Design a binder for this molecule. Structure first.
Ligand SMILES: *[C@@H]1O[C@H](CO)[C@@H](O)[C@H](O)[C@H]1NC(C)=O
Ligand SMILES: *[C@@H]1O[C@H](CO)[C@@H](O)[C@H](O)[C@H]1NC(C)=O
Ligand code: NA
Ligand code: NA
Ligand code: NA
Lengths: 322, 263
């Protein structure tokens, strides 16, 4: 059991964190399982070639370091790579291929863009399930994302358009987060989400959505987050075929009408959250009262109250006569 | 019932109440000892996604799954270490060594503080992981934080925290390797450290105490209940002298037996 004189080693956990390191010290034992290298000044030239031979390392924590390209010379069997808060710009096939067993990649707070990711970079990442790209320089969703991805976070980027090929064939994806990007209804491509058979959660919070998107996948969708947009209307087919949808949330949106029957396909809608919406209460909303009176006991609905006209502003919709 | 009067030195721990089985293996729950009403606060642990605090107005509502409100937090949370104290939530902000204070009446972050040199984000968690590196605790003496540093070779460090300025008021290094502990809690300024079996060290007991009044520590052996073999949270409440425990999806409370106090 050797240990770098600068580090602390305990039963496979290698603590080299917060130690003003510009390179990884010599002397990490070959039974190392977890490398704590966070809160250092390590750059790519600081990662020695010998590191690749630490065959038992499954997790590397390299967040808050000085990497400006995807790290190379990594232990071959590493499964979890935490790279948040580096200056990483570019991802290449050579770097990704060298760690074929990677399951979890956290790249939050880096400078990755679509053009920076080499074409086919992920072709050999046949085990990658979790990819976090929050707070990067993405303008679009990269093409060629591994077909095995289950969770994809692209929040707080500058995404403007989504191409159907980019999400095409991501049949295992169940969680997609697109919060805080520059997406318009115009930006969403036709049927971009349609073929996400396994998708369970779709989050579009804090985008610039004006109308609820359409052609959402129903086979598996259970949660859809549209809160904190400016959605004035619900197209008649916005919730068509969403037979598994469990929670739907359009709080904090400019909803004044709900056309009759938009929830007709919501067979499983357990929690429906419609608070913080400017509900106009007139002829067109009479159905709501009845639909809420006939609403099943298990279903929990909240947030439906009149704001216009002035006379009945603030009065619960499910109670008004006319 | 007096949350500022020391009940003594802990001598025994007993299962008291089994409330229900959560849908999440790990999490924490508690009451606010400086709050007159019987509110319950609930935060299941969901990796990479823990960002809400749920509030129930009664035990019946809690068991029925009927929240009074849910608080959307301004940042994600690491681990199961949160507390609620005089109407504020305190929690470890995800992938930081910082405590955030979030006022519940106004739903606004009212403070943040750095816990100097604390390891964080699955570096010195309790034994089950879950980014449980930093654990808050309330007792008769006030607000505490339980963590580890590399200066103390990964062993538990205790700091007393000012609940309004968020400045460390005192710091003590213990002799106990934090990752070896299942959990820990404070009573009367004494740290009690739990060792227990996990489903996947054959003893379930409090095997170590550190007394911050004296800066003195010792080995002990107080049997500690562990029916489900996955302790994710242990929170002491100085108002009712109970432990609020989350064990392998089970939300339960443990009663305590005390003997004459230490210095
Ligand atoms: C989609 O999810 C189901 C869940 O039952 C899983 O069995 C299936 O493998 C997933 N799709 C693919 C292509 O793996
Ligand atoms: C949910 O939808 C399924 C069809 O996919 C249906 O069989 C079921 O009855 C629905 N849930 C409820 C509670 O009715
Ligand atoms: Na007391
Ligand atoms: Na706690
Ligand atoms: Na605790």
């Amino acid at each position: 059991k050797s240990c770098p004189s600068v580090c602390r080693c305990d039963a496979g956990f290698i603590y080299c964190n917060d130690r003003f390191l510009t390179s990884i010290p010599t002397g990490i034992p070959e039974d190392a399982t977890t490398l704590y290298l966070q809160n250092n000044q390590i750059n790519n030239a600081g990662i020695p070639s010998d590191l690749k031979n630490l065959l038992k390392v499954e997790r590397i924590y390299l967040y808050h370091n000085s990497l400006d390209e995807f790290p190379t010379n990594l232990p071959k069997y590493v499964k979890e790579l935490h790279l948040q808060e580096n200056n990483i710009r570019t991802i290449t096939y050579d770097s990704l291929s060298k760690i074929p067993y990677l399951e979890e990649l956290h790249l939050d707070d880096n400078s990755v863009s679509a053009v920076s990711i080499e074409e086919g970079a992920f072709r050999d990442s046949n085990y990658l399930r979790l990819l976090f790209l929050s707070r990067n320089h993405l303008s679009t969703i990269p093409w060629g994302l591994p077909r095995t991805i289950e969770e994809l976070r692209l929040d707080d980027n500058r995404i403007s358009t989504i191409s159907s090929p980019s999400l095409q064939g991501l049949t295992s994806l169940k969680r997609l987060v697109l919060d805080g990007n520059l997406l318009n209804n115009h930006g969403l491509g036709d049927k971009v989400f349609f073929n996400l058979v396994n998708l369970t959660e779709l989050s579009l919070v804090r985008n610039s959505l004006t109308a609820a998107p359409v052609n959402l996948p129903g086979t598996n969708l259970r949660k859809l987050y549209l809160q904190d947009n400016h959605i004035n209307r619900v197209p008649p087919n916005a919730f068509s075929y969403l037979r598994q949808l469990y929670r739907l949330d359009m709080s904090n949106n400019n909803l004044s009408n709900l056309p009759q029957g938009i929830f007709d396909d919501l067979d499983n809608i357990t929690q429906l959250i419609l608070r913080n919406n400017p509900w106009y209460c007139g002829c067109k909303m009479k159905w709501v009262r009845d639909w809420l009176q006939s609403l099943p006991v298990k279903v929990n609905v909240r947030g439906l109250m009149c704001q216009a006209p002035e006379k009945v502003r603030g009065m619960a919709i499910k109670d008004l006569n006319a | 019932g007096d949350p500022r009067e020391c009940p003594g030195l802990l001598k025994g721990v007993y299962q008291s109440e089994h409330l229900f089985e959560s849908d999440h293996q790990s999490g924490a729950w508690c009451k606010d000892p400086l709050q007159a009403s019987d509110k319950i606060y609930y935060m299941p642990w969901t990796p990479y996604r823990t960002d809400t605090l749920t509030e129930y107005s009664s035990k019946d509502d809690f068991i029925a799954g009927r929240p009074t409100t849910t608080y959307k937090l301004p940042h994600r949370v690491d681990g199961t270490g949160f507390v609620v104290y005089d109407g504020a939530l305190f929690f470890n902000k995800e992938r930081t060594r910082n405590i955030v204070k979030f006022d519940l009446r106004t739903r606004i972050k009212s403070g943040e503080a750095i816990i100097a040199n604390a390891n964080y984000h699955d570096t010195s968690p309790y034994r089950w992981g879950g980014k449980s590196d930093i654990d808050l605790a309330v007792d008769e003496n006030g607000l505490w934080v339980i963590y580890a540093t590399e200066q103390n070779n990964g062993k538990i460090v205790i700091s007393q925290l000012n609940p309004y300025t968020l400045r460390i008021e005192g710091t003590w290094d213990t002799a106990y390797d934090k990752r070896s502990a299942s959990n820990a809690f404070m009573i009367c300024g004494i740290l009690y450290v739990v060792k227990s079996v996990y489903e996947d060290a054959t003893g379930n007991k409090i095997d170590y105490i550190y007394n911050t009044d004296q800066s003195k520590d010792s080995l002990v052996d107080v049997p500690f209940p562990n029916s489900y073999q996955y302790i994710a949270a242990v929170d002491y409440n100085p108002r009712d002298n109970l432990l609020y425990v989350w064990n392998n999806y089970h939300v339960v409370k443990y009663s305590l037996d005390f003997g004459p106090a230490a210095a």
